[PDB]
Amino acid sequence: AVISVKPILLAMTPVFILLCLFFGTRNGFYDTDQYHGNGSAH
Amino acid sequence: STFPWLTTIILFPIVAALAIPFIPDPTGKGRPIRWYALAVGLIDFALIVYAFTNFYDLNTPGMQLWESYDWIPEIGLRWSVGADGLSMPLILLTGFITTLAILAAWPVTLKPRLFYFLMLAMYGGQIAVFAVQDMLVFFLAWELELIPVYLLLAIWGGHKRQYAATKFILYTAGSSLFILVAGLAMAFYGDTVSFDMQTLAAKDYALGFQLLVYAGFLVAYGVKLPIVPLHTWLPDAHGEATAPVHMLLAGILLKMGGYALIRMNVDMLPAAHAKFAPVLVILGVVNIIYAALTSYAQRNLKRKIAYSSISHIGFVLIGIASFTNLGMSGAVLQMVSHGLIGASLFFLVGATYDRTHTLILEEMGGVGQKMKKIFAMFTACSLASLALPGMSGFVAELMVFIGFATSDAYSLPFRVIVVFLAAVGVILTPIYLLSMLREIFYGPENKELVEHEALVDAEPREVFIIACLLVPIIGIGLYPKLLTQIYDATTGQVIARAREVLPT
Amino acid sequence: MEPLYQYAWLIPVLPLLGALIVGFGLIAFSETTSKLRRPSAIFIMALMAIAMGHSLTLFWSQVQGHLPYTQMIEWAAAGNLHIAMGYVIDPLAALMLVIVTTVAFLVMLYSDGYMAHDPGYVRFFAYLSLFGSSMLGLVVSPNLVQVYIFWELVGMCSYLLIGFWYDRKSAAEAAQKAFVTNRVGDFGLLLGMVGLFWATGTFDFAGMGDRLTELVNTGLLSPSLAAILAILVFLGPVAKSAQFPLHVWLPDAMEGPTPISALIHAATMVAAGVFLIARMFPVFEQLPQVMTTIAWTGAFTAFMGATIAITQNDIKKSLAYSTISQLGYMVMGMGVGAYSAGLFHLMTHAYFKAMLFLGSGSVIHSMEGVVGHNPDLAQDMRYMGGLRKYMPITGATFLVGCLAISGVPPFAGFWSKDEILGAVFHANPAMWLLTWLTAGLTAFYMFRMYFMTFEGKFRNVPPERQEHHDHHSHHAAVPHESPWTMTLPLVVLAIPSTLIGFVGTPFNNLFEVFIHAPGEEKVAEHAVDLTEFLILGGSSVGIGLMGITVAYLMYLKGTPSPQAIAKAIQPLYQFSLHKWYFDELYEAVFIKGCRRLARQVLEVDYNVVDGVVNLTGFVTMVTGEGLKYLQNGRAQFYALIVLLAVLGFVIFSVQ
Amino acid sequence: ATDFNRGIMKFDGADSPAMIAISAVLILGFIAGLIWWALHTAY
């Protein structure tokens, strides 16, 4: 009796994909203040 | 199983990064280019899971995505790919981190057509390191992430970028040549001129010949995986980098020097491994004690955890050079654990620098009063690097200690001193990680707040990248057989190929 | 039994989900969950009360005569190297199950009173259930691996809770010290856990004692070499129970919240630091040199932390110095062998230090009324004397907490305290008369804290005269500030103190020891008599009784002044006032030394091994700037090198 | 060492070049002393 990785990775993969596409749309501070500007670490 | 899977997964982000100069609508910064790189990074990671959950067929020693295409019959190099147990976790780890490294590369608006080209070229070029069963394609893929990671530091980096970028490209191209030197020395040994990693492992080499090849590979792999004499390239290029570039640097590129130590220095060179295994566990402990003190002695924030990446690497060398089925199981686990722990830590350093713009850590203090979700995630990510149980940073180091001092390879006066000295890093890692948390967030004494650090917030996307990185951190910490079942049968053949060598 | 014992793993994982849910609700929904402060408290408190319902019938099933029940699930397997992690339901473990979850449900009742003025109300109940879920797994642990998953886990919750407020610079440095000093104990525990898996070969406590005694008499292990294994495992509990080398973090652990101080002295100090050595008596009983080491470092801590509690004005810091000594008073009972009584001074410590700690916070929330928010020591500004003259029910509940820790005639301590005093005057009474000397001193500093702050006048006139706070004038002087959520937990934690008026009596002292059997059935004792037990008790009650009459007369003169003591014993008074001069030894040597050793590892990195790298790039740049001067125009010179190399190659190649 | 000596707990006072070489021979000698230990004490 071993919990196998394949059924829980295949079940968490479409949860992982559609949340990356959703959480990109919802974001803050990188569009309004944004005093870092173009150079991302200058 | 007839479809080219690992050939596609390697070659998909390379051929799709060529469509990045042809992406329309350049309305200001590159917003559709940013969404295009996430769209291809997500569907390429889904190809890794589709090749895993349908065609990996675990507890089977050997490659199960083995596709040996002919490229140049005159030299003898083939396009031979394949994922065994030493490759498939790191192939799955590369597809997972780089997908978030595109998501971490959202505030970059400097040269967005150039950024997501080189990051996708690293996405095809890092899977290509663990997957190929060859030498001249392995040296190709090792130096495939030589130009696009140079330009990721030299354009989007801190200050002293040009010192950090040119020191790095001279230190790794000047050390990848020993993969060509030792890879050609092994293939021309004897009579068969094969270059695949299968036949070159089964070939019998002399003991004096293998000590030159082992010394050549240790110069080549002691640079990327930072063994502490050849480590000075790291905290400059890791100290001057952005958050998404750093998740590929410490998350994946450091593990290619640890993947090839188990693959090209233990499988192919077992008799030279046994003669020079006690120098690795000495170099592995002094990887920990040197870097954890240097993390405490440094006050630059991005440079502190950059040295902490060298200390968690130090437990891999004790795991490889222990000849134990549990010791080597803790070495591959430390490569997957620190890749998830570091890419979560180094994402939050670029998140903290995006609000405070200092990294000096003297003008900081009381940041946790202003932003709260960043400090709540900076604590839990630094706690995973404390080797705290319930997280994968502990069981990766627990298997190394148990795997070392149960092995019938070293003597008893040697095994006690190494385990006692490698456990000093158990004390030393809460010294600087908690002092970094204290001298940034804990306290009332804030900054000037009028010239520097005028803004403070916490984006909900930055919460998601941390929270999805802590699921394989905690989920391996509550069940370490979730990753061990990928390489339980392959590590059992790597160690047993060296168990036949140890009476020597 | 079968749905009660096979689902016994629900007791750790139920309060874990209380923090998993609201932790996911604070990191993503912080606008609503911070407003949802009152319902999320009762939601977390419900799943602790459900886990209280498990342990109250799992332990009650054990005292009726049920067998111990084990379970093991594989954790991390390899070639011939397995890790197993499950649980056991032991009468020792089931007694520890009730102790940790009664005082966790009780401190959640207390938590509604000390705050709901604090905006960190929701996060406090998240961290409280994270403490319990990490500690309810430590007590059910069958293995040395399984005690180590939750050894550093409760050290994490001890780190997160001491630095709960995180806006003080004092609580900033306090939380970091508590993790490091516990990690040195975790450094010793991890060394011995691998070291005992090396020798024996299994991680369970039952399979470790029989394997250690199999090799120490055969000749495989040495009696001197295998002795160093058990002291390393013992170095774990010397950090969590605050023994002699590692006790510095306890004066600073009082910089956190007052309800946490009751839980870091009932759940991770007297519970955790005593349970691990209690489970390892299969190992320690076969090694005599280890047990005299444990008893010696317990005997000094009963004297070390005792003297620092006197001339300590702070109420929380004086209780922290007491539980240094009372733990040392208890760990030395496990050093002399008589450890069943060491586990029955466990029940009267957790329910009475929490009586003293939670009772102290009712004084602290009262002291915010007339006095400002900064001082909480022995009272100034209407100075020390009277709080119980205002007649609160919070005043009489730490007096009975102080009454049962001295050894007084009409209450507890007459039945509980002096049982390990007769067992310690057997073997080495010269080095262990020191505990009898401080036995009147534990009666000193506890009653020194009673009538200095509760008997006199503490409402007349302010000496400092600076509060000026609207949150201090609304802090409800005349000590009824303590709301209805202090009426219950300051009383219902004493309904076992009435039960110890019935259990642990001269007909129930015997019937409890038969429950707490050792690894074998044997009970070792030197000599107990019928006639000698009265003078060993009747003279041991008097030293505790005269230890408070020298305090009843000292601190009711106004000033602590018998003759030639105002001009004090400054050779010794400078030790206790400046806190043993032990914090500055650890600071000027170890902290500065690790700031000095580490610095020259950075400068040998940046200059020596980085100088070789910046010299390979320097002797190549100045090489190309030396052969740049090889060409200089003047094409006659270019024809010279062509004609010289012709003359070179005709001598070089003819031989 | 001017940037290494910020206004926090560092700058102990031994950052001289006479101390850099004498810290090198102890640190690099301990690694080499453990390496030469390793090829003989192990087996």
PDB file of C-alpha atoms in Angstrom, chain A:
ATOM      1  CA  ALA A   1       0.000   0.000   0.000  1.00  0.00           C
ATOM      2  CA  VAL A   2       1.868   3.033  -1.361  1.00  0.00           C
ATOM      3  CA  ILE A   3       0.386   6.385  -2.353  1.00  0.00           C
ATOM      4  CA  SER A   4       1.501   6.745  -5.958  1.00  0.00           C
ATOM      5  CA  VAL A   5       2.539  10.089  -7.423  1.00  0.00           C
ATOM      6  CA  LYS A   6       0.932   9.739 -10.883  1.00  0.00           C
ATOM      7  CA  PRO A   7      -2.813  10.054  -9.964  1.00  0.00           C
ATOM      8  CA  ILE A   8      -2.186  13.090  -7.743  1.00  0.00           C
ATOM      9  CA  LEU A   9       0.145  14.822 -10.215  1.00  0.00           C
ATOM     10  CA  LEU A  10      -2.267  14.255 -13.108  1.00  0.00           C
ATOM     11  CA  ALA A  11      -5.105  15.595 -10.935  1.00  0.00           C
ATOM     12  CA  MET A  12      -3.151  18.688  -9.825  1.00  0.00           C
ATOM     13  CA  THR A  13      -1.807  19.563 -13.293  1.00  0.00           C
ATOM     14  CA  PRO A  14      -5.015  21.119 -14.755  1.00  0.00           C
ATOM     15  CA  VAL A  15      -5.508  22.846 -11.412  1.00  0.00           C
ATOM     16  CA  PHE A  16      -1.976  24.230 -11.807  1.00  0.00           C
ATOM     17  CA  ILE A  17      -2.456  25.380 -15.409  1.00  0.00           C
ATOM     18  CA  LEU A  18      -5.759  27.256 -15.136  1.00  0.00           C
ATOM     19  CA  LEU A  19      -4.599  29.067 -11.985  1.00  0.00           C
ATOM     20  CA  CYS A  20      -1.464  30.441 -13.674  1.00  0.00           C
ATOM     21  CA  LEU A  21      -3.688  31.788 -16.454  1.00  0.00           C
ATOM     22  CA  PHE A  22      -6.036  33.294 -13.845  1.00  0.00           C
ATOM     23  CA  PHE A  23      -3.523  34.758 -11.376  1.00  0.00           C
ATOM     24  CA  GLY A  24      -1.726  36.597 -14.170  1.00  0.00           C
ATOM     25  CA  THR A  25      -4.820  38.728 -14.736  1.00  0.00           C
ATOM     26  CA  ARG A  26      -5.140  39.625 -11.030  1.00  0.00           C
ATOM     27  CA  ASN A  27      -2.053  41.559  -9.931  1.00  0.00           C
ATOM     28  CA  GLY A  28      -1.075  44.830  -8.304  1.00  0.00           C
ATOM     29  CA  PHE A  29       1.814  47.273  -7.744  1.00  0.00           C
ATOM     30  CA  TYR A  30       3.514  46.366 -11.046  1.00  0.00           C
ATOM     31  CA  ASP A  31       1.279  48.698 -13.059  1.00  0.00           C
ATOM     32  CA  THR A  32       0.515  51.763 -10.886  1.00  0.00           C
ATOM     33  CA  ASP A  33       3.500  52.831  -8.753  1.00  0.00           C
ATOM     34  CA  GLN A  34       6.219  50.810 -10.543  1.00  0.00           C
ATOM     35  CA  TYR A  35       9.256  52.874  -9.619  1.00  0.00           C
ATOM     36  CA  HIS A  36      11.573  50.020 -10.589  1.00  0.00           C
ATOM     37  CA  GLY A  37      10.452  50.746 -14.139  1.00  0.00           C
ATOM     38  CA  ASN A  38      12.150  49.148 -17.130  1.00  0.00           C
ATOM     39  CA  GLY A  39      15.384  47.934 -15.539  1.00  0.00           C
ATOM     40  CA  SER A  40      14.057  45.202 -13.291  1.00  0.00           C
ATOM     41  CA  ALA A  41      16.912  45.318 -10.772  1.00  0.00           C
ATOM     42  CA  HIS A  42      18.831  48.550 -11.494  1.00  0.00           C
TER      43      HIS A  42
END
